[PDB]
Amino acid sequence: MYWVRRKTIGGSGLPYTENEILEWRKEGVKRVLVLPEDWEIEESWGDKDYYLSILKKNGLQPLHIPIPDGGVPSDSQFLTIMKWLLSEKEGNLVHSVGGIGRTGTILASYLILTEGLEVESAIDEVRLVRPGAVQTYEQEMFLLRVEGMRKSWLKNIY
């Protein structure tokens, strides 16, 4: 687990046991944006809903926004993602399966919008703590498309 912005927003891969979840809490995580698809959670936990309830039992507020591996969120999922991350500033955790592709894409999106950074700079910022963040061409294009319509997104986010 890594923080992109000290205790405000970080990322991680998919936890395998409840102990990794407790570590998140111990680290200051308070809200969790779950990005992997149903089958991906199922493959490791046995049941998607059980996993989400387990986040709650451990004191975390989860939000499940399914994004295909190597892919990006739809416009609706993104507006939803940004409003969620922004409605409560501290202790935000974003996670995928490896904590690199989808997670890096969202975190970099976050910076492009909240810090007005270009794509390259945002990805670079995330890579300081998460080597390799952002894996695909589709993800790169998403971030570019986002930087391009920055004001539009901000107008909608707020």
Shape: globular
- Oligomerization category of the chains in this entry: 1 chain of a larger assembly
Number of strands: 5
CATH architecture: Alpha-Beta Complex
The side-by-side strand order for the widest beta sheet comes to 1-2-5-3-4
CATH superfamily annotation = Protein tyrosine phosphatase superfamily
**In the residues, how many domains can be counted?**
1
Largest sheet: 5 strands, mixed
What's the tally of helices? 8
Approximate helicity band? 40-55%
Could you please say which CATH topology applies here?
A: Protein-Tyrosine Phosphatase, Chain A
CATH C-level category = Alpha Beta
Distance between the termini: 29 Å
Radius of gyration over all CA atoms, rounded:
14 Å
Strand content: 5-15%
Structural class designation: alpha/beta
How do the helices and strands follow one another from N- to C-terminus? EEHEHHEHEHHHH
Structure characterization notes:
The chain is built from eight helices and five strands. By secondary structure, it is of the alpha/beta class. The chain is globular and about 40 Å long. Strands 1-2-5-3-4 form a five-stranded mixed β-sheet, sandwiched between helices. The chain has one domain (1-158): Alpha-Beta Complex (Protein-Tyrosine Phosphatase, Chain A). This is Protein phosphatase.
